């Protein structure tokens, strides 16, 4: 019932989530770019 | 009164609460260069 | 003196910290390239 | 047995982390933008 | 010898530390890339 259960695998998730993201962004942008420049 | 009443609830804010963000520069930048390049 | 005394309104600085930085980054590029592009 | 062992190793992991990404994204779009604009 | 010490100068540390990053990215970009284009 009382909060503070776990932070330990809390804290693991934004860290390899931002990750995914962080790929989609800078992959995703070199595609839709390289094939309009080239 | 006293401080650390919960932190899982809001570590999860920050995660998704970024996605959002993240996702907002990725397809911005896109539609906007895509559309001068183009 | 002793450690722990306040996480709740700490994490909630950089979220929104980030939140300023992730935008700047994405209006500041737009505005230059489309800029030089166009 | 019981949660909450460590977080101050932890929440390094994410810093040092996110660093290794945000870097590959500036890096590799310039490569790979600037070959095909030059 | 025990875990938990200090959590809130470490917070700070990824917050501040992202700042640096996140304008590396879209400064050291910029000026290839309006190079590059200009």
């Not at 009382?2 to 390899?16: A, D, S, T």
């Amino acid at each position: 019932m009382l909060p503070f259960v776990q932070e330990r695998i809390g804290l693991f998730i934004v860290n390899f989530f931002i990750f995914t993201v962080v790929s989609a962004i800078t992959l995703l942008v070199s595609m839709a770019f390289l094939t309009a420049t080239r």
